[PDB]
Design a protein around this motif. Structure first.
Motif, short mmCIF file in Angstrom:
data_model
loop_
_atom_site.label_atom_id
_atom_site.label_comp_id
_atom_site.label_asym_id
_atom_site.label_seq_id
_atom_site.Cartn_x
_atom_site.Cartn_y
_atom_site.Cartn_z
N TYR A 257 -4.97 -14.31 37.86
CA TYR A 257 -4.96 -15.56 38.45
C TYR A 257 -6.02 -16.48 38.13
N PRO A 258 -7.25 -16.14 37.93
CA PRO A 258 -8.12 -17.09 37.54
C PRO A 258 -8.04 -17.51 36.07
N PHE A 259 -7.45 -16.74 35.09
CA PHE A 259 -7.15 -17.06 33.80
C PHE A 259 -6.03 -18.16 33.52
N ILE A 260 -5.03 -18.08 34.54
CA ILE A 260 -3.96 -18.97 34.36
C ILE A 260 -4.32 -20.41 35.00
N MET A 261 -5.50 -20.37 35.68
CA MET A 261 -5.82 -21.47 36.50
C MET A 261 -6.78 -22.37 35.40
N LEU A 262 -7.51 -21.48 34.37
CA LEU A 262 -7.99 -22.01 33.19
C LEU A 262 -7.27 -22.86 32.04
N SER A 263 -6.11 -22.05 31.99
CA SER A 263 -4.97 -22.55 30.97
C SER A 263 -4.21 -23.72 31.41
N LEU A 264 -4.08 -23.55 33.07
CA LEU A 264 -3.64 -24.92 33.60
C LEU A 264 -4.05 -26.16 33.26
N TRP A 265 -5.76 -26.10 33.38
CA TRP A 265 -6.36 -27.06 33.02
C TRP A 265 -6.68 -27.28 31.76
N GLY A 266 -6.13 -26.34 30.52
CA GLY A 266 -6.36 -26.40 29.30
C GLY A 266 -4.88 -27.20 28.72
N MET A 267 -4.26 -28.12 29.65
CA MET A 267 -3.06 -28.71 29.41
C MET A 267 -3.34 -30.12 29.65
N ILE A 268 -4.10 -30.64 30.55
CA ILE A 268 -4.31 -31.89 30.91
C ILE A 268 -5.41 -32.71 30.03
N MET A 269 -6.53 -31.70 30.31
CA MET A 269 -7.90 -31.95 29.50
C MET A 269 -7.79 -31.82 27.89
N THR A 270 -6.96 -31.15 27.26
CA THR A 270 -6.71 -30.85 25.97
C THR A 270 -5.59 -31.92 25.46
N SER A 271 -4.75 -32.50 26.36
CA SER A 271 -3.97 -33.54 25.69
C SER A 271 -4.67 -34.92 26.03
N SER A 272 -5.40 -35.12 26.83
CA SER A 272 -6.23 -36.47 26.98
C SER A 272 -7.06 -36.56 25.86
N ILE A 273 -7.83 -35.79 25.27
CA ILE A 273 -8.66 -35.97 23.83
C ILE A 273 -7.54 -36.19 22.84
N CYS A 274 -6.37 -35.66 22.94
CA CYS A 274 -5.41 -35.52 21.90
C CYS A 274 -4.65 -36.96 22.20
N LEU A 275 -5.41 -38.23 22.00
CA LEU A 275 -4.82 -39.45 22.24
C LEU A 275 -5.77 -40.61 21.48
N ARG A 276 -7.04 -40.39 21.83
CA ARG A 276 -8.10 -41.52 21.12
C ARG A 276 -8.79 -41.05 20.05
N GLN A 277 -8.31 -39.73 19.52
CA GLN A 277 -8.93 -38.88 18.14
C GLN A 277 -8.72 -39.92 16.84
N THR A 278 -9.54 -39.61 15.91
CA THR A 278 -9.45 -40.49 14.82
C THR A 278 -8.61 -39.74 13.56
N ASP A 279 -9.14 -38.37 13.35
CA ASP A 279 -8.35 -37.71 12.38
C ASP A 279 -6.94 -37.38 12.85
N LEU A 280 -6.07 -37.42 11.65
CA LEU A 280 -4.65 -37.15 11.65
C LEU A 280 -4.38 -35.87 11.99
N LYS A 281 -4.96 -34.79 11.30
CA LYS A 281 -4.90 -33.40 11.33
C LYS A 281 -5.41 -32.97 12.69
#
Lengths: 457, 118, 97, 604, 67, 169, 166
Positions: A257-281
């Protein structure tokens, strides 16, 4: 049938003359991959064991076929690199892929946990030598040390976990014998028994915490782009989470139950950074975190519907992200920098590769049923049976799935290219062949995705 | 961000200090343009030019991570509440929904009769 | 001072002294590899491999179960009242508590 | 038996250019004509089963390509040919039939002339899947497919700036509309084992969670509405036949089309009835207001669809699915003409997209101007100009209900508001003295233009003769109030046009009047570029840059192993650099070690 | 007449020709696959008699290529 | 056929009395297209069916019944459990497609009536509600992923509720 | 410069006027009214009074600033095809064309080869002439014109030659 002809690739590259090498390594690998689909697909109600416990049958693993699919593809994009250097150096880093292919077949085939462990960490050794050499940019070691000290720090607790089970409850071995396993009583002493089996797979399958293992491996490129496909194989190489959660701890889901909640926030915050990044890779590196985070959610629910979406996403991501990295390599070989803003210009200079850029990007989104619609949507449908609140968080993620793909398109769809003078030839005959060999197998899965998702399907 | 009046041509004076200020801006602008002019207008090149300003832009996010953050102060703790904090926020949301569901299965059934999937 | 560090040079095949090729150096090696055996895998694994995938060898009781279910429905409808499921694999269990 | 066989022919005919797209046979310059010939015979093959439907016949077909066998489910390529699905096919095909031959004249002598037709066929195929969808999984293929093919069509013109903003937003606001649609999938699977559309008619559950946060939320993403609609005027940046299809028959139906098919759910639930009309009340006037101030040839027609969409939302709220599709079918014929007859002006007078600069007089252009008068009056409540057979039937039915009074009063102002922007195409640009956009401007009628506009006139006039009469209705609405309800639908168009003519001529014909600078205009764009183009993309990226990246994803979430390196090296230095040689010091430490084993540790 | 905008084209059009040549080369067993249903009989539904359980193909219905 | 119920027979007969006109557009097109290519398709299908001649009978369906149930043999041993676990998985895979047939019976009712929908049928509605409720209780649907060893505990949980409720009343 | 700031505002004021008014005859009426307002202060030169009017010019104009102004056709920014309709192809891609296809229409290839040979020879002479200009830093504002008549080509050769065609 599978092992032995894969081992015979090692004397093949060394005995052959200096002018050839690449012709023999690619052609012979393609006919072994044809024979993998010929025999492994046959199964009854419950998938019966292959032979003695050295390499066993597949129960819910069509993911072995993907390793056989990349078996020649990990040589095609690496052709642009390695050619400048010595002939002996060429033979060495083809055989390191052969050794990778040798150990990766052994992980998915062998129905074990004790001997599976010494094949699970065994894939890390050839990739380490692959990453620490041929890196064009610096900080190879600030990614090479992080490659092991994330994985081995989490996976060495399996020695105190797996052996502890077989000393008390019969033996692990076949897994087909594993019905001796009694449900866990859930106590404070049983907490570290569950954590040690999970933390090993919490690293290879990236979350929100302890996720920095993956972007360092992708940004600091090993060799060209063909070795980055092997880094995709390492994500799906931690497939034992399908086997451990179902068999070893069936009653234990309160600590999940706590590990699902960790991965659930590893969906919004991991995607937000994947927007303003410089490197194509890097914009593929962080989208690969969230796409594999969907699988971790599905496993810990333990519903029969979620494993269907879990097994689909392992194959879905294994041929879409690797496709995206080949497109990143095709720009890296011409512009000589992984910057998104500098490398700008499709259709005008790259007329036919731009259509491959479109097909690869849209597959990250939910297209007409290829594999990702059978992958992603199946997890979202299964999360509602867990809790009603999930789709409020999961729906926001479905907006930003476009924001990986379209932002990669638009920032290359400007036909300016004023500073750039290179990239005269758009793509070689091999370069266009790479792009077709990733999407067309997924386009054939539209007709029959039975060999794409099969845990009791 | 926007003020009461949009800045475009608001508050401008000739003076003496402002006249030399525009001369300072053009001095660097023409200097960096001419080195581009010498690199663009020749057929002998063939390739992508480096430009030191663009490399330092990519180096600003990819590197300079641990050379910074040495003054933590109270600003870093506020960022931790915006990161580790929201993880604890859903802990009192998902559990309350599950305890609502688990009580219904045992007593006073709420689940549909035509349900079989998962 | 660099002494021996300066050695880097830009290299590209493109079209110059290659005509039209994918493999680096030698036209004889290029045609026989990059267009023949590169596309032989495109013909065997993709085209001839499309016949398999899941179509043909039944694949884990997907087609078998349909014929098995239909004959069990018509048999249980004529004689019994309960349709298929009522008490799954349970007939006289030795107590509970 | 003939009904099942002929239904698949229309599906196969549209895929035949795609089958011949991959080399196959060489076709130089004939490929744009090949698309025209393929759809021409597709209309005739679709006319026969609709004629069969008026007589007798209803058939559902599956191709037996069931790719899912997962947990009590079968998912074949299902094709439904019933009422709402059946009638829409020849309507949509005849709309495209004119646009494809229009695409011969517009976008001519281009290097990518063949590729433009490629996406338009896929834009037609994906819609035809959504129309005939009988599975909810089959429904996703169409509802996303039309939304994903729009990226290649809106951002068709290869622009370095501004052109790609529209194509991004077209899916971005659509995917916020997806949140409901994917939630509508998950609720449907868990509560009902069947998953397909054939379930809802038997054992229908009474729940507010399904249609509100689901189908209605899908109706806000796709097909304009109030929730998110900044993608409508931006879509005008692309070519004119693309902007025609998105707002006449294809993209404009996708939101409403779902709600008509789910008609038993709307009738039973009372809370859904109110919220569909309450959200539908804001759609009527707010979007119609934006059509007044915004002065661009294409962009006036863009906001006019959303004002027409208000009435399309009322039909669902009033619980009448039979009158719901009738408005959209006639709307398809309204704006297939109106988009490209006005689009003919843009191509003629160089490249001008503004109504102010345009001066296409009625005497100057004889053929294009005649369609502009008929098309604009067709939107307003006219007795025999196909307006009464679509628009007026909703207004008369709405008055006799237990529904919201404020929503009913708001729709009545919008029906009179239709006359203002329709005359703002005529009086503002077409009528009066020409503005003269450029010195020596050539405007001539082409052979391809005459064959397209004249054959569109049959569809725009005979729509109230064929569609309204042949289709079997349920429950007659016209009975009560001859002056309060029945006359009010027609009087609003008459009083609206008189108010529009008096207001426009007072500003135009004045000479010396002086326009006032200070005004209360919340009308220019509706203040959506200030919140959804200025604030909403900034807030998602500020939390990405000020937080997330510069705090967690690079520093704090990393600080687990560098935490055990910085402290590990400090512990490493306390052993290596410690004790600077000397045998003396090492032997002094051995004195303590024996004392630890004897005193500190209890062993002998 | 004008020189117009120029693309590569030669590298682009050749790949599509080289792709389709190997589809057509293995397009012959696709054509045989149709005639395998036409010439040879597929399967018939019949009750099994107690004599032989499996011979060549154990249990396969539809298509001769499955057996 | 046999297993699928459906409607007995459809009427479908045209009268055509009002208006002379050109007879009927639906009737004229039906007669024309029946001999145009529909007759040629029937002739080509008959030509290929006759060309087969020799055909294999084949076993198709396999037997294998009972072989001791899972709720009869106990204690962790591979020799006894493996035959029992294969039997339960055989039943579970068939029961997944048993529901599919009953689901398709409800699918057939919806189209054939249309306007009636829930007013008639009733037999298909009652048959679906009885099976799905039994499928929810007996064949997992709540007790995680499929396992034969966990199924006996699921059957014991339902049996414990029957013993506790009846004893009180 | 004071002269440039007045002209930049006056150019904007005329184009922003046609958004409020509909007809061209009414546009000419207000155009004469704007001329009379600015000619009153233009007659005398001031350092304090004229600069005060320049900041005052921003007012009244900003009160009626957004009626959606017309940019007409292809304009820098604004609306309706800013970079659209002209996709174009770079000059680098022209030389990148492979043989056999390059053999078709030899008039375009041979003429371009003659211009390329002239550009290669003039590049060495242009480099010395560019640094010959007196600045001794790099450059001052704009590029300098050619002094020599025999050699030709003023600094940049690929700036004007080969751009874009609609």
């Amino acid at each position: 049938k599978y092992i032995i002809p894969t081992i015979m690739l090692m004397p093949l590259t060394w005995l052959s003359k200096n002018n050839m090498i690449w012709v023999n390594s690619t052609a012979h690998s393609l006919l072994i991959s044809f024979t993998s689909l010929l025999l492994m697909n046959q199964f009854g109600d419950n998938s019966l064991n292959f032979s003695l416990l050295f390499f066993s049958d597949s129960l819910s693993t069509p993911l072995l076929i993907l390793t056989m699919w990349l078996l020649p593809l990990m040589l095609m994009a690496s052709q642009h690199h390695l050619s400048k250097e010595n002939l002996t150096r060429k033979k060495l880093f083809i055989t390191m892929l052969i050794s990778l292919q040798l150990f990766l077949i052994m992980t998915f085939t062998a129905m074990e946990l004790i001997l599976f462990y010494i094949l699970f960490e065994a894939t890390l050794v050839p990739t380490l030598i692959i990453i620490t050499r041929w890196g064009n940019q610096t900080e190879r070691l600030n990614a090479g040390l992080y490659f092991l000290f994330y994985t081995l720090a989490g996976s060495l607790p399996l020695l105190v976990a797996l052996i502890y089970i077989q000393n008390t409850v019969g033996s692990l071995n076949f897994l087909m014998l594993q019905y001796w396993v009694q449900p866990v009583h859930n106590s404070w002493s049983n907490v570290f028994m569950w954590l040690a089996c999970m933390m090993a797979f919490m690293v290879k399958m990236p979350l929100y915490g302890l996720h920095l293992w993956l972007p360092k491996a992708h940004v600091e490129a090993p060799i060209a782009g063909s070795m980055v496909l092997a880094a995709v194989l390492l994500k799906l190489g931690g497939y034992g989470m399908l086997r451990i959660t179902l068999i070893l701890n069936p009653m234990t889901d309160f600590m999940a139950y706590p590990f699902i909640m960790l991965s659930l926030w590893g969906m919004i915050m991991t995607s937000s950074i994947c927007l303003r990044q410089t490197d194509l890779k890097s914009l593929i590196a962080y989208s690969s975190v969230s796409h594999m985070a969907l699988v971790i959610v599905a496993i810990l629910i333990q519903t029969p519907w979620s494993y269907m979406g879990a097994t689909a996403l392992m194959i879905a991501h294994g041929l879409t992200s690797s496709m995206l990295f080949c497109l990143a390599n095709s720009n890296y070989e011409r512009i000589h920098s992984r910057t998104m803003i500098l490398a700008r210009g499709l259709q005008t200079l790259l007329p036919l590769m731009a259509t491959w850029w479109l097909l690869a990007s849209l597959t990250n989104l939910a297209l007409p049923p290829t594999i990702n619609l059978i992958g992603e949507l199946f997890v979202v449908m299964s999360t509602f049976s867990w809790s009603n609140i999930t789709i409020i968080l999961m729906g926001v993620n479905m907006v930003i799935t476009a924001l990986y793909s379209l932002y990669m398109l638009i920032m290359t769809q400007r036909g300016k290219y004023t500073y750039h003078i290179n990239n005269i030839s758009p793509s070689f005959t091999r370069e266009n062949a790479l792009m077709s060999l990733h999407i067309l197998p997924l386009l054939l899965l539209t007709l029959n995705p039975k060999i794409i998702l099969g845990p009791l399907y | 961000x926007x003020x009461x009046x949009x800045x475009x041509x608001x508050x401008x004076x000739x003076x003496x200090x402002x006249x030399x200020x525009q001369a300072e801006r053009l001095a660097i602008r023409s200097r960096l343009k001419r080195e581009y002019q010498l690199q663009y207008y020749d057929p002998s090149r063939r390739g992508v030019i480096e430009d030191p300003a663009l490399v330092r832009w990519t180096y600003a996010r990819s590197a300079n991570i641990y050379p910074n953050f040495r003054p933590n102060t109270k600003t870093s703790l506020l960022g931790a509440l915006f990161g580790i904090g929201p993880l604890v926020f859903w802990y009192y949301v998902f559990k309350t929904d599950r305890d609502r569901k688990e009580k219904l299965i045992q007593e006073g059934k709420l689940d549909r009769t035509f349900n079989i999937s998962y | 001072r660099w002494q021996e560090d300066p050695e880097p040079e830009d290299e590209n095949l493109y079209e110059k002294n290659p005509d039209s090729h994918g493999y680096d150096k030698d036209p004889a090696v290029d045609i026989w590899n990059m267009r023949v055996v590169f596309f032989f895998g495109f013909s065997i694994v993709l085209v001839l491999g499309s016949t398999f995938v899941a179509y043909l060898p039944d694949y884990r009781m997907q087609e078998w179960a349909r014929r098995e279910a239909e004959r069990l429905v018509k048999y249980r409808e004529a004689h019994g009242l309960p349709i298929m499921e009522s008490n799954c694999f349970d007939p006289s269990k030795i107590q509970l508590p | 038996n003939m009904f099942s066989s002929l239904s698949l022919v229309t599906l196969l005919l549209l895929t035949m250019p795609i089958m011949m797209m991959s080399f196959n046979t060489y076709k130089p310059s004939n490929y744009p004509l090949y698309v025209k010939t393929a759809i021409s015979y597709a209309f005739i093959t679709s006319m026969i089963p609709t004629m069969m439907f008026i007589h007798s016949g209803q058939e559902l077909i599956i191709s037996n390509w069931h790719w899912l066998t997962i947990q009590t489910l079968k998912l074949s390529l299902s094709f439904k040919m019933d009422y709402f699905s059946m009638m829409f096919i020849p309507v949509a095909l005849f709309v495209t039939w004119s646009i494809m031959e229009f695409s011969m004249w517009y976008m001519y002598s281009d290097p990518n002339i063949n590729k433009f037709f490629k996406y338009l066929l896929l834009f037609l195929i994906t819609m035809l899947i959504l129309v005939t969808a009988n599975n909810l999984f089959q429904l996703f293929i169409g509802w996303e497919g039309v939304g994903i093919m729009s990226f290649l069509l809106i951002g068709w013109w290869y622009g370095r700036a501004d052109a790609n903003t529209a194509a991004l937003q077209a899916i971005l606001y659509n995917r916020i509309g997806d949140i409901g649609f994917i939630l509508a999938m998950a609720w449907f699977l868990t509560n009902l084992n069947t998953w397909d559309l054939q379930q809802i008619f038997m054992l229908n559950p009474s729940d507010s969670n399904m249609p509100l946060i689901g189908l209605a939320l899908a109706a806000t993403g796709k097909s304009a509405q109030f929730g998110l609609h900044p993608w409508l005027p931006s879509a005008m940046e692309g070519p004119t036949p693309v902007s025609a299809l998105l707002h006449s028959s294809t993209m404009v139906v996708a939101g409403i089309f779902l709600l008509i098919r789910f008609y038993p759910l709307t009738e039973n639930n009372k809370y859904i009835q109110s919220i569909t009309l309450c959200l539908g009340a804001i759609t009527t006037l707010f979007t119609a207001m934006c059509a007044l101030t915004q002065n661009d040839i294409k962009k006036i027609i863009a906001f006019s669809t959303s004002s027409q969409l208000g009435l399309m939302m009322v039909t669902i709220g009033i619980n009448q699915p039979y009158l719901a599709f009738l408005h959209i079918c006639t709307h398809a014929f309204f704006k297939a003409m109106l988009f490209m007859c006005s689009g003919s002006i843009i191509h003629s007078l160089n490249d001008e997209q503004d109504i102010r600069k345009m001066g296409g007089l009625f005497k100057a252009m004889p053929f294009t101007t005649t369609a502009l008068i008929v098309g604009s009056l067709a939107l307003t409540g006219m007795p025999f100009l196909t307006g009464f057979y679509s628009k007026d039937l909703i207004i008369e039915a709405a008055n006799t209900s237990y529904t919201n009074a404020w929503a009913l009063l708001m729709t009545l102002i919008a029906t009179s508001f239709t006359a203002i922007y329709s005359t703002r195409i005529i009086f503002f640009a077409l009528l009066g003295q020409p503005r003269f956009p450029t010195l020596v401007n050539i405007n001539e009628n082409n052979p391809l233009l005459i064959n397209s506009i004249k054959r569109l006139l049959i569809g725009s006039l005979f729509a109230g003769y064929i569609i309204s009469n042949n289709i079997p209705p349920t429950t007659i609405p016209q009975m009560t109030m001859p002056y309060y309800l029945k006359t009010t639908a027609l009087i609003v168009t008459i009083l609206g046009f008189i108010l529009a003519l008096e207001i426009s001529n007072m500003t135009k014909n004045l000479k010396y009047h002086y326009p006032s600078n200070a005004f209360k205009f919340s009308t220019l764009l509706g203040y959506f570029p200030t919140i959804m183009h200025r604030l909403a993309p900034y807030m998602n990226l500020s939390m990405s840059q000020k937080s997330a990246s510069s705090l967690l994803d690079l520093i704090w979430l990393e600080a687990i192993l560098p935490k055990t390196i910085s402290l590990a090296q400090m512990k490493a230095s306390t052993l290596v650099t410690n004790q600077k040689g000397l045998i003396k010091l090492y032997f002094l430490s051995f004195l303590i070690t024996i004392l630890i084993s004897m005193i500190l540790f209890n062993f002998h | 007449r004008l020189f117009i905008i120029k693309p590569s084209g030669f590298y682009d059009k050749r790949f599509l020709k080289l792709l389709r040549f190997y589809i057509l080369l293995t397009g012959i067993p696709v054509a045989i696959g149709i005639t395998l249903i036409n010439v040879x009989x597929x399967x018939x539904x019949x009750x099994x008699x107690x004599x032989x359980x499996x011979x060549x193909x154990x249990x396969x219905x539809x298509x001769x290529x499955x057996x | 056929x046999x297993x699928x119920x459906x409607x007995x027979x459809x009427x479908x007969x045209x009268x055509x009395x009002x208006x002379x006109x050109x007879x009927x557009x639906x009737x004229x097109x039906x007669x024309x297209x029946x001999x145009x290519x529909x007759x040629x398709x029937x002739x080509x299908x008959x030509x290929x069916x006759x060309x087969x001649x020799x055909x294999x009978x084949x076993x198709x369906x396999x037997x294998x019944x009972x072989x001791x149930x899972x709720x009869x043999c106990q204690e962790k041993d591979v020799l006894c459990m493996f035959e029992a676990e294969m039997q339960w998985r055989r039943d579970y895979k068939v029961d997944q497609e048993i529901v599919n047939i009953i689901q398709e019976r409800l699918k057939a009712c919806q189209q054939r009536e249309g306007e009636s929908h829930r007013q008639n049928c009733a037999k298909e509605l009652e048959q679906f509600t009885q099976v799905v409720k039994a499928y929810q209780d007996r064949y997992x649907x709540x007790x995680x992923x499929x396992x034969x060893x966990x199924x006996x505990x699921x059957x014991x949980x339902x049996x414990x509720x029957x013993x506790x409720x009846x004893x009180x009343x | 410069t004071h002269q440039q700031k007045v002209l930049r505002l006056y150019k904007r004021a005329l184009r922003h006027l046609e958004s409020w008014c509909i007809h061209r005859d009414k546009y000419r009426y207000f155009a004469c009214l704007l001329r009379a307002r600015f000619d009153e202060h233009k007659n005398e030169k001031d350092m304090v009074k004229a600069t005060q009017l320049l900041r005052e010019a921003e007012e009244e104009f900003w009160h009626g600033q957004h009626p959606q102004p017309y940019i007409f056709p292809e304009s820098p920014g604004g609306t309706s095809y800013e970079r659209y309709e002209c996709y174009k192809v770079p000059e680098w891609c022209l030389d990148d064309w492979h043989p056999s296809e390059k053999a078709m229409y030899p008039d375009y290839f041979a003429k371009r080869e003659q211009w390329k040979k002239l550009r290669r020879e003039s590049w060495e002479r242009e480099v010395x002439x560019x640094x010959x200009x007196x600045x001794x830093x790099x450059x001052x504002x704009x590029x300098x014109x050619x002094x020599x008549x025999x050699x030709x080509x003023x600094x940049x050769x690929x700036x004007x030659x080969x751009x874009x065609x609609x």
